[PDB]
Subunit: 259 residues, 4 copies
């Protein structure tokens, strides 16, 4: 077969203590992978990795701290010997207008900087160090050494009012996908991005039932939030068929976020 | 699990006697689907369906002939009892300039009409009649009755010189994806499109080794043509992962067809 | 200056008896161009060209009839000596579902074929014959001989329920833009496409006040339908700055057509 | 007419001492605008504003410094009384691989942060403070108070090897366009983005003649670099044609940057 198994592959998943990252971790472990969850010391990463078993470790690190990402990845190398997959999933989401015209108040622009730091700089930091570990691998049967899977958002395409900073960070992840795939083409490292629609994760837990019902009403079909396993399954499919590369895949039940 | 098995699903694959359609047919059959290949009486469809075994039938028909498509789908219903999946894959590809400026000669405009008839009208015809069969299903646990998977091409986005007619037909398939997913949203019929890059099929059989090497040189990574099983694997993932809807997925090794 | 004047350029505008085509004709005549309006004998083309003055002629033709397009363009050559601009604007719009699931009724697929014939085949027919006339021109200061401006629609990107055939035809026009620009690159013929949002034209005159108010409510800003002059002005800008090529330009007041 | 004149409009152009920003500044000045160029104290902004005459001022500031941007825009208000237009044009471009696989060396990740700071944070800072000034205008006859024009790049879509950071910053600008247009929709502030191809500016001054010839060879038609006046002409068209909103316009001679 031209498709490979996930069995015995080593994957790092940032933001893996929660939501979509945890969904990807569970799906990969379920199909025989070793998984390191990278998440904040304040996260529940230790408890999550414990419940997920002996093929799952928790490497605490902030993706905005390059030295912490370096050491987390060096612990992955010590524990599992190699890295095959890096899943960029950690991210934060703000909602604010740049200038409230009615009340004449400027936003806090540092909220733009923090969004860009976690959601973009963290992806570059994790991608750079993952590539360093991949370069230790021998090219496999397909000439491959690793794959980087980034988590953007349909906000990169359908950004709503209040989301300019978030949509900018997600559009940055869209824009980096193809040049990075081109950078690593002859090194055998693919780069693919998933753009989820609305998924039922802690990121959406602040919303009350009225807002949840309104957001579900917008999703054409299936008429529900996505579930983390469906994101994890798409992550797994990218891992298994090597001809996916340099592309952004919308996973959203045909949602287009309205004005 | 939120992802379903392919086992027992009944799939119609147009163009199924060759190339990508045959790739999708074989992949679904190997994962337990019942597959009907719809292809031209002049094709090798009978022998191919024999090769693929007892879970495969050949329904001869031209996708440009509404009465033949309706007849073929009635045969699918008679044989397998229902329809779950329709893969629009049949298509043709010409190469010509609309006006040769150096020689002062107009193209054969009916070559554009034929491209549009097979590549677009055929998809609309198959989709409408597949929808008729889906409407006889009960909604499953995800609220679904069927899924239509269209094969566009990255020529819809990267159209090369000589490809205006082919690119137009493939751009049409891209454009139809979201409104059709919206049409059938509350009916539980998803519509998803795959945009393949260059794949090793009889469509490319004419090209001599020098052209093959040149085209391979363009693909960043994996540095090869796609193989039909990778297209069929993506078809199956769309079948199993219900939150994919209304999207176009490039499957192309990061290729961007140049000028 | 690197930008040229419209003064003394010869432009053909299909669908020019009405709506956006007439808007482009008026804007070009207002800025010193000779304009031939191509439209159906049933249209008001003769009356419109009369009111638009002696720099405007009416060449009756159906864009689905290649021989009628050939003769219209040969009359443009007799009347004005040359062709500099061809604006593809004629189009038709249907609204229908491919299969009404509630009442179990298939659409009339010939409505798909007619949509594709007028909206796509007509653009190819007009583009081919315009190119033939352009090839008679000497390359200008910028190396250019002509420009083809196609009118797609944001339905090529935001297609709503009921619009699958229309969105397919408009996605076909999107897809043809880049390969045609590449075809004619070294012949000096640019190809650019405009994707209008909702404009106040006879195409939208069937809608009652309640529907009009609903459609206006969807347009973020300016909160109104576009006016034909704004489409005509963008057509003119494409004519005047030669570095626009191979692109589709949304002209829509930030509208995204919702589910 | 639905298209307004540029005469009397007050425009701030960041990066206005060079290249495309200077191109936009000169075009608006020649059509009667008051223009303030915002650029670094180390730039030639003072001399350039002298060249451009009495309707041009130089407001020194770094777009990464919110207090300097606010101060510069207060100067614009003091001198010209209001603000109608803000052109985000200032930006930097690095070229580097995230990990050199052959030499086993990580990139300087702070080069990514600087790219994002100037190219994205600077656009957000200028946009927020420009919005503050727009909010002091009365709505004009089209209901508008201002327009923000961002300069992305086709690297947002065609990112080459070595360009991941630059492409990310330009993809961020693409992503921010629609949500910002939605943010300010009822306030009458449009947001439009231009994605230039390769233009003849000091950003490309380092490249020797062999690289220039190679890059020119890639542009289909016109087969040359863009000149800054063509960028300024498109800026002016967006200023005058109010139905352009929430869109990204490629201005690139049909170039698609290859692998
Ligand atoms: N959930 C959705 O509906 C949705 C939609 C589109 C895209 N996304 C994207 O999906 C990704 C995952 O979202 P989610 O729903 O799982 O969110 P979540 O809040 O459930 O999980 C985010 C995780 O990131 C971690 N994290 C935050 N900052 C970090 C840092 N500096 N270093 C390391 N880890 C850090 C958090 O601790 C948390 O565990 C994000 O990038 C988000 O933007 C989410
Ligand atoms: N092969 C590639 O590199 C590639 C990449 C881009 C897109 N595609 C698309 O993939 C699809 C499959 O192409 P392929 O590579 O498998 O080509 P292929 O020639 O191997 O197979 C196409 C099949 O379509 C059938 N067909 C043609 N006209 C038909 C009609 N009127 N009715 C019914 N069947 C008809 C043919 O009999 C043939 O078996 C097409 O839609 C094509 O445009 C192919
Ligand atoms: N108006 C909108 O809101 C809108 C939005 C998106 C795109 N468009 C596109 O803009 C273009 C113009 O639309 P409009 O609003 O001006 O419509 P319209 O109905 O006002 O004008 C269409 C014109 O096309 C002509 N035409 C039709 N069939 C023809 C044929 N076979 N040969 C020659 N002429 C023919 C008609 O006679 C008519 O004058 C169309 O292509 C349409 O799809 C319209
Ligand atoms: N030139 C091209 O080929 C091309 C194509 C794609 C995109 N672009 C984009 O066009 C824009 C303009 O680039 P250009 O070609 O005119 O380059 P340029 O180098 O000629 O001009 C850029 C100007 O930005 C100013 N600038 C830099 N950092 C600044 C800061 N912190 N604060 C204020 N001003 C600052 C510089 O002083 C300089 O004058 C950029 O955003 C660039 O990414 C350029």
């Amino acid at each position: 077969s031209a498709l490979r198994s996930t069995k015995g592959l080593v994957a790092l998943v940032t933001g893996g203590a929660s939501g979509l990252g945890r969904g990807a971790a569970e799906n990969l472990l379920k199909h025989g992978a070793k998984v390191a969850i990278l998440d904040l010391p304040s996260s529940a990463g230790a408890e999550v990795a414990k419940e997920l078993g002996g093929d799952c470790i928790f490497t605490p690190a902030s993706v905005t701290a390059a030295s912490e990402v370096k050491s987390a990845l060096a612990d992955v190398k010590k524990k599992f010997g190699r890295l095959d997959v890096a899943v960029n999933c950690a991210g934060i989401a703000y909602s604010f207008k740049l200038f409230n015209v009615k009340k004449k108040k400027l936003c806090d622009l540092e909220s733009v900087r923090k969004t860009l730091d976690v959601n973009v700089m963290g992806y570059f930091t994790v991608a750079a160090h993952a590539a360093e570990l991949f370069a230790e691998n021998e090219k496999d049967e397909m000439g491959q050494r690793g794959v980087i899977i980034n988590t953007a958002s349909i906000a990169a395409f359908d950004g709503q009012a209040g989301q300019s900073a978030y949509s900018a960070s997600k559009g940055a992840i869209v824009g980096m996908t193809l040049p990075l795939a081109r950078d690593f083409a002859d090194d055998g490292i693919r780069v693919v991005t998933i753009a989820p629609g609305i998924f039922d994760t802690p990121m959406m837990a602040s919303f009350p039932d009225k807002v949840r019902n309104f957001l579900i009403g917008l999703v054409p079909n299936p008429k529900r939030f996505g579930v983390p396993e469906e994101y994890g399954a798409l992550v797994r499919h990218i891992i298994e068929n090597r001809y996916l590369n340099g592309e952004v895949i919308r996973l959203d039940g045909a949602l287009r976020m309205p004005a």
